Amino acid sequence: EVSEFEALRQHLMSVAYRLTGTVADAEDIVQEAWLRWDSTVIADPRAWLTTVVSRLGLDKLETYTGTWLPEPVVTGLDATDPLAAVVAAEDARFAAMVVLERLRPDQRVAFVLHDGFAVPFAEVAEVLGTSEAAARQLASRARKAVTDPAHNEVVGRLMAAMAAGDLDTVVSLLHPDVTFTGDSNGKAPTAVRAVRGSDKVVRFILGLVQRYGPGLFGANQLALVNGELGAYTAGLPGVDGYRAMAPRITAITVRDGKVCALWDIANPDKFTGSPLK
Numbered sequence: 001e002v003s004e005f006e007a008l009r010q011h012l013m014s015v016a017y018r019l020t021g022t023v024a025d026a027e028d029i030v031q032e033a034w035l036r037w038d039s040t041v042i043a044d045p046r047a048w049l050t051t052v053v054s055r056l057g058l059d060k061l062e063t064y065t066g067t068w069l070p071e072p073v074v075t076g077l078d079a080t081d082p083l084a085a086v087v088a089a090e091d092a093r094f095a096a097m098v099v100l101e102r103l104r105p106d107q108r109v110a111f112v113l114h115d116g117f118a119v120p121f122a123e124v125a126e127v128l129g130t131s132e133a134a135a136r137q138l139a140s141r142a143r144k145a146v147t148d149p150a151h152n153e154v155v156g157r158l159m160a161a162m163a164a165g166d167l168d169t170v171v172s173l174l175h176p177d178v179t180f181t182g183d184s185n186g187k188a189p190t191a192v193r194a195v196r197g198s199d200k201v202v203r204f205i206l207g208l209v210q211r212y213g214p215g216l217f218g219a220n221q222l223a224l225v226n227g228e229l230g231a232y233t234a235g236l237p238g239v240d241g242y243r244a245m246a247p248r249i250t251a252i253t254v255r256d257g258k259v260c261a262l263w264d265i266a267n268p269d270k271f272t273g274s275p276l277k
Contacts, residue, residue: 099146175261182194
């Protein structure tokens with residue numbers, strides 16, 4: 001009873017959160033799935049509730065600032081959490097999700113349902129509303145809009161290293177076009193606009209340890225961010241004339257064995273995938 005049930009709702013949550021970029025937006029869309037279950041004698045609850053959720057997800061597809069970013073899901077290292085199964089998929093990675101958010105409120109459902117969730121186009125066409133090839137084409141314009149197993153090794157190395165101020169190591173681990181992007185909807189000093197490039201990202205970073213100090217690392221917890229090892233912070237008070245910092249969640253993106261991007265998420269309104277909340 002509960003098993004088959006939880007597996008479906010997980011599937012429903014898995015698709016819902018990805019349809020948007022918010023776990024509250026998924027929490028409210030799966031909310032109707034149950035209510036719209038009504039009819040059966042013979043039925044396929046799995047295929048039906050997707051459409052219901054997918055359409056409600058399309059119904060979705062304060063706010064006086066800029067540079068939007070997706071709400072993250074933060075589970076413990078056991079990944080036993082109920083929101084873990086949501087982001088267990090590798091394409092639920094924060095990098096993958098920011099690609100999807102603030103970019104495609106149209107090519108989303110076609111790409112997500114098919115690339116991510118392996119839904120054939122005829123069924124995607126159903127929630128869509130048109131032809132077979134018209135689902136593949138609204139999906140093909142998504143796969144174009146896009147243009148490592150060392151993650152823990154690279155995040156791990158980094159998590160400690162930077163506390164030595166080993167700057168020679170840190171600039172090599174970064175991409176020449178590495179990025180630091182902060183969700184500035186939240187009232188918190190961040191990259192209110194995106195900062196670009198290696199040496200220049202380091203500069204921004206140097207300001208951080210300068211501003212908040214070294215207690216910085218002690219409030220920063222090791223945790224799973226969207227299925228892979230990232231980190232979040234409970235915040236700091238600042239007692240040696242350092243600025244009081246805010247609790248926030250920081251995701252990391254890795255390729256070439258180098259940190260290709262960093263993500264700053266500081267809006268308290270987006271903590272519903274978090275231990276903070």
